[PDB]
Amino acid sequence: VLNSNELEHIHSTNHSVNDISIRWGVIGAGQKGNKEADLFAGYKFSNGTTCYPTLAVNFAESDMMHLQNIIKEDRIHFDGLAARTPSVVTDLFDPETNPNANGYLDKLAQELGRKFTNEEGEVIVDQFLICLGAGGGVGTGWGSLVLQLIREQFFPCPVSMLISLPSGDPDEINNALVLLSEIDEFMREQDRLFGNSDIKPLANVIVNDNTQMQRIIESQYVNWKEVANDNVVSTLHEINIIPENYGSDNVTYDPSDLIKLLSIPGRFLTIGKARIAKFDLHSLENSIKRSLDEGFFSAEHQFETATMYGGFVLRPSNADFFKDVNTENRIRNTLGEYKRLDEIAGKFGDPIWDNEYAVCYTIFAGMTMPKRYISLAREGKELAEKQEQLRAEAQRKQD
Numbered sequence: 501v502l503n504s505n506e507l508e509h510i511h512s513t514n515h516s517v518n519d520i521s522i523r524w525g526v527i528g529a530g531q532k533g534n535k536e537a538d539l540f541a542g543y544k545f546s547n548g549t550t551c552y553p554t555l556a557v558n559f560a561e562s563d564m565m566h567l568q569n570i571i572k573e574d575r576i577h578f579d580g581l582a583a584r585t586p587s588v589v590t591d592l593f594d595p596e597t598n599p600n601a602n603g604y605l606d607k608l609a610q611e612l613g614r615k616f617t618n619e620e621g622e623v624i625v626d627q628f629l630i631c632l633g634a635g636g637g638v639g640t641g642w643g644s645l646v647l648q649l650i651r652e653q654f655f656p657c658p659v660s661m662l663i664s665l666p667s668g669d670p671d672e673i674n675n676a677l678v679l680l681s682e683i684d685e686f687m688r689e690q691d692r693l694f695g696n697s698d699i700k701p702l703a704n705v706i707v708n709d710n711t712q713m714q715r716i717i718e719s720q721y722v723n724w725k726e727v728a729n730d731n732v733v734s735t736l737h738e739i740n741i742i743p744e745n746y747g748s749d750n751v752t753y754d755p756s757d758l759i760k761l762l763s764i765p766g767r768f769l770t771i772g773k774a775r776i777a778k779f780d781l782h783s784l785e786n787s788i789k790r791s792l793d794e795g796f797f798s799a800e801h802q803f804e805t806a807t808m809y810g811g812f813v814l815r816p817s818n819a820d821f822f823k824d825v826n827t828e829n830r831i832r833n834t835l836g837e838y839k840r841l842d843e844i845a846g847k848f849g850d851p852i853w854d855n856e857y858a859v860c861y862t863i864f865a866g867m868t869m870p871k872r873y874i875s876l877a878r879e880g881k882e883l884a885e886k887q888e889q890l891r892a893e894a895q896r897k898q899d
């Protein structure tokens with residue numbers, strides 16, 4: 501499956517795509533998470549093997565049945581009863597409600613053995629990628645449970661969470677808020693318990709905002725969710741392929757650099773994918789600026805709080821514009837406007853590939869809570885009043 505023309509152009513070109521920088525183990529909870537997970541499950545190497553071991557987790561037999569790359573065996577469901585909400589979902593893994601918790605919890609763990617470990621016993625995975633759509637019951641709940649679980653040291657290795665922020669429904673935007681709050685707290689506890697050099701149990705959290713993503717999609721059938729998913733998932737896959745499979749005459753972003761970036765900072769992380777086809781300094785600047793501020797991973801991030809950077813421009817073989825001093829400190833200065841590269845750890849490469857255009861990936865890690873959190877807090881309470889008041893204005897009229 502090839503859900504971006506970058507992936508198309510590097511599978512027709514390159515038939516040595518036999519490894520990736522980080523061996524993710526993907527788990528998708530809730531409907532959104534399931535769908536993203538289903539995309540990951542589809543990706544294969546040039547030889548035909550699957551790239552990522554993937555599980556789908558949900559409430560119901562029902563929820564999971566139109567998946568395409570996830571075998572039925574790997575569709576894990578947990579009978580519920582009752583209200584579908586983040587809090588009563590968490591509490592099915594807590595004998596504080598279910599006598600079935602110590603079984604339920606020792607079921608998940610034996611589907612963790614089966615899918616991400618060998619016959620031998622050893623784990624076949626560097627970190628877990630947990631996909632969620634904040635707002636729903638099942639997804640948001642799983643989010644909280646995961647925080648709780650990684651404090652039980654339930655997982656063999658670190659956990660990266662790919663979380664999506666809800667569009668506009670006061671119940672959803674409140675659910676989303678309590679999760680994002682739980683995350684901010686956990687990240688602050690993690691900062692006091694682990695060194696700046698140590699591997700963090702919560703590797704990072706990557707957010708997308710559903711409002712920002714729709715805005716974009718209606719500019720460039722038309723299911724917007726299906727398209728949003730293709731973009732975020734294909735982007736993460738791309739940045740995982742590239743360091744393992746291409747290098748540079750000037751500066752290579754290797755897989756170790758990417759692993760450090762995703763492993764150590766342990767807070768909020770963002771990505772900017774910018775296509776480039778004008779080979780000049782202005783169109784370069786805008787593309788980068790646009791991908792960072794008005795792209796799929798933009799949620800009014802606090803770039804000044806970034807503790808690490810990474811990135812690379814995949815460029816054509818002839819292209820000696822991207823080596824150049826202007827070009828280099830132009831990028832250095834363009835990215836410099838967000839966080840001054842001189843003040844934070846990182847590296848920025850320029851790999852070669854068999855194509856005649858260039859794509860520029862930018863990653864900032866270690867950031868603090870994104871400002872979308874505040875504007876959501878605002879926008880949820882704003883539409884909350886609107887609807888309570890509507891309610892009353894309808895009841896008034898009747899009476």
Ligand SMILES: Nc1nc2c(ncn2[C@@H]2O[C@H](COP(=O)(O)OP(=O)(O)OP(O)(O)=S)[C@@H](O)[C@H]2O)c(=O)[nH]1
Binds near residue numbers: 559666672710
């Ligand atoms: N970006 C994106 N968001 C989605 C997609 N599907 C659902 N969402 C969004 O994510 C949030 C939760 O959706 P969903 O995945 O259906 O929750 P859920 O876990 O299944 O919640 P539940 O009520 O059954 S218990 C909502 O804000 C919804 O708009 C998707 O495919 N892409």
Ligand SMILES: [Mg+2]
Binds near residue numbers: 530531563636
């Ligand atoms: Mg659902």
